[PDB]
UniProtKB/TrEMBL annotation, chains A, B, C:
It comes from the Bacteria. Gene3D superfamilies: Jelly Rolls. NCBIfam families: encap_f2b (NF041163). Pfam families: cNMP_binding, SrpI-like. Signal peptide: none annotated. GO terms for cellular component: cytosol. The keyword Thylakoid does not apply. SUPFAM superfamilies: cAMP-binding domain-like (SSF51206). Ca(2+) binds at T29, D32, R34, E50, E53. Keywords: Calcium, Metal-binding. The lineage of its organism: Bacteria, Bacillati, Actinomycetota, Actinomycetes, Kitasatosporales. GO terms for molecular function: DNA-binding transcription factor activity. This is Sporulation protein.
Amino acid sequence: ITSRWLLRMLPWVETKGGAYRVNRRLTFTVGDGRVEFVQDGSTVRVIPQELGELALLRDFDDAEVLSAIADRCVQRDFRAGETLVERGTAADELHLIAHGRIGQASAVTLDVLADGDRFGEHALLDEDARWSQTATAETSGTLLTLSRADFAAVVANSPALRSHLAAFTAADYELKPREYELSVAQTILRVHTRVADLYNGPMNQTEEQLRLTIEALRERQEHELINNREFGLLHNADFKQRIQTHSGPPTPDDLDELLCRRRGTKFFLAHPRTIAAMGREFNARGLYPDHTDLGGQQVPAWRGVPILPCGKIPITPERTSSILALRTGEEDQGVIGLRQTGLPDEYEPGLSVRFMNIDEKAIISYLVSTYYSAAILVPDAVGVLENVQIANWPR
Amino acid sequence: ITSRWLLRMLPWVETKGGAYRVNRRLTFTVGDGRVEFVQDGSTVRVIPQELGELALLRDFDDAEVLSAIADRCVQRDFRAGETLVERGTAADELHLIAHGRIGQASAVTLDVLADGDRFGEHALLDEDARWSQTATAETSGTLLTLSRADFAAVVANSPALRSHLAAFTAADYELKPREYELSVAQTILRVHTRVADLYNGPMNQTEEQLRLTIEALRERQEHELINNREFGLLHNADFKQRIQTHSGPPTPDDLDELLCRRRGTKFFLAHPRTIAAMGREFNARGLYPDHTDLGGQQVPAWRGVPILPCGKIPITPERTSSILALRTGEEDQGVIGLRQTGLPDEYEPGLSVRFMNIDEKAIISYLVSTYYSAAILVPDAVGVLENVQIANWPR
Amino acid sequence: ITSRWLLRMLPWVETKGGAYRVNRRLTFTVGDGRVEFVQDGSTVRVIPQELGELALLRDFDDAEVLSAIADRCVQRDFRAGETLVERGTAADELHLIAHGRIGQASAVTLDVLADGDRFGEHALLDEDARWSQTATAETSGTLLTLSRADFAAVVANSPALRSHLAAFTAADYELKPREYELSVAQTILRVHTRVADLYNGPMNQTEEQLRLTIEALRERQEHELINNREFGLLHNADFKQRIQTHSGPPTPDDLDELLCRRRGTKFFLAHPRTIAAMGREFNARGLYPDHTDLGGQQVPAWRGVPILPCGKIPITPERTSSILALRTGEEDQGVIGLRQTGLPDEYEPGLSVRFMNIDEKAIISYLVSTYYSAAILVPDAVGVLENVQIANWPR
Ligand SMILES: [Ca+2]
Ligand SMILES: [Ca+2]
Ligand SMILES: [Ca+2]
């Protein structure tokens, strides 16, 4: 029953056959010390050529071997405050950082690794490798893992890798399309025959129950568009577009930085608590931002970019939320809503309600279905500001 | 396949939402020795104020206490010839007679209690009470029971009742609406796909089976209108309107008395055996009653009031039936038939047949439903003559 | 004669029969440590199932027993600074906090209980319970009380509760409609016959007195809409919607928080002294808010939400007031004004003036009547900021 800003602001394009295709250009360079990954929503995998940045794998340019090694890595997720390695334990895994920040404490906290960083190089070759530092994850993220045994098996499979390893011991264009499949929000409405036969004259309680079902389906659509893992702006956003706050509260400098990373930002999405925190920061700084009108409706804005509240954005137990800055459009490469209309029996242009059967207990069943998904045409269309402290008050 | 006189004679009114409301006035007096009850079909309950007729409860006019005591009584039914109490057994229950006649035989048959009579007064207060007479039920009826333990608990709950009991030891208008909910006659018609695909050209065996189903539903409607317990003229009739025959056969004096109790009686309903017995009585008395025309159809009548046969009126094993005298109308306060038309898919104005599903065995299922009920606007609209001996012949 | 902003801003809906019905959904969870209540204006009562949160009543799910226990609690109001319990006095009452904050000082001020908190658990079972802490009420509020004797009586009534107590010693959907009855503002206008016979040519002093009467009735309507106990936005507002100021003066952070709790807030209502205090806070912070136009009339606003003055909001002797943030509408679930037009003799669409009689002293009497009430469709439509210090100046 709440406002669904993402549903009414995202343009909707008609897919054919319940599928969409997005052509991706992935520019990457070899030798800059940072590994680039391919992200399909929440699942990520290392580019086989990028893997050649490895010191023990430099100058190896055999597509088969690199592809096999890339396929043999395992994706892992780490939470905030979780310890990945401890001093003294033998090192046997190569860790490539895809997202998040990991503070490494030596025997003296050395530094903090970030996206594209590596630790566990020497563990691949020799068995004497031992973790001499402890890695504590300050922020949640993903991580690719290459085991020593798997690497030894891959070496024993390909003679060329063996020979190169024995010898060593002594902008690239990659197009790979991304396919989006329409997800479904489905439900079954059970209406008793008595409720359909009698309560139908001045108002249809069947029709009112159907309206409630449709509202619940739309709320689920918004919740999935925000929080789903396969598609969904929070997770299906480029790892480079996710920023961390400079101080923790959503200061206006953070909003300026969020507007810096992309051209023609359309709007901000944040929790109402986050909007209250931003207002508190504005009052502390002493500046009063203007309000702009969209669709004949006035709304708070920053630098003329409207800030829209969304209650479906999760709030962590540590009272930290995230802010989304995103541009929408098809002619301008942005974020589009994939949806198929023209269903066989539409109560609503995007909906389909169909009679299923009548049970022995005289209960009619209806199937209410809608098909939806989200696509991000270019990587720089959704930016996420993370770990925004929303429980800060002036003191 | 038989004639359904009640279905075609009762006027039908359209209920909204499958419910009807009847406003009841219940005039009662305190101190006349007879307790008045509230009857909702076959379930009856004593008026809390009427309960103050009790000698040990006179002058108590606390609504809470009387209401609690009234709620704590239990309804019981007794059959003809059943013994309720026996001499020697300790008395522990207060019995309020709601219907029927009970002959009380002392240590010498004292008399016969009837509707509104009480026995078991002294049993409420003291534990020494002992049944010194035997009560044999000559006629079936209902009876309210108040246990000694329950009364002691109610006394121990309310201090005011205690104080009044300790002290004693040394026309009223009550409006209470009655709500009628539409009952349903439902059935499932299973038609094989072969019978629907082939046998459909010159006549539809599916349509003939549906017609048979509709006829069975109408017969069930009549049987419920006569014999059902919640609604139904035999049971949902005022206890004052039920009369007993003077001699046992349906003599014309009994018909005159049945016509006496209400104004503008519309018709009589009786079993064909009962009509034969009435004809035998008429022949014995030597008078030949006239016949009147309703709907262009001639029918036997008494005093110009048509007598209609109904085979759904039960015949007891002792060969005793009952006769119903009833007036129908809405402008004239009488008996109406509650029925809702305008169903979503009507083969007939009151019917609804809907396709359910087709089974794996290629059997189509149809749901045939009709909604009906009966309402009696005023108490003096249905009178019942009971224990009519129908197996009497001249000798 | 003052401006009545609430009268002219609240939309008015036509009730039928002088009554309105609001369908309430009350989502509650068992085991989260907070008890949920049902509020009908100023009278509140604990949910029987919520009462099962009690440690000694956990896992008891008998509707009769819980309903009885809930009915047997007593509602109490406490003022600011009032001491409820003192150390040393034996504990005999269970206190469930419905509103307000209560600071508990042990033998060391432990903490401050708030809405949904409980103290007095152990007092229910044993008679040795003694208050060992003193509870001082910092803010006015309500409180449910369950006495030990009443609980013992309820235990002695139901055997199931006994058995469960002996054994222990060793999201839920609840729909309950709320009914609103139209209140009446009535008065008698006494006009002398001389004033009606002579002073009627160039102007009617009778008509001017009637106009003054109508103005007084409208002022009383506004005062009741704000301050009445049964209906009225100050009291008939959800206990969760009432907030406390962070510092005491109405700082802009408090206004941001007040706008945070609900979507599409329509306007603020505050005393003119409160508006002066808010302006002082704005000047201290150095920001100058914009002004918006409603009905062709310019008005001060915060974040585009107009701030309207209302002199009917009480000012406490401690110079503390309250602010109301509220959205109005029927299509958008908000606050509506229940009012019935089409009266038998209307001088004004909502009014009814009728001649009563002429006294022996030649004084004509007129009855001026209007019917009004207020309804809040959803709980999150009126928010109240309380204890706003309005006598603070820069120093
Ligand atoms: Ca690289
Ligand atoms: Ca009586
Ligand atoms: Ca709870």
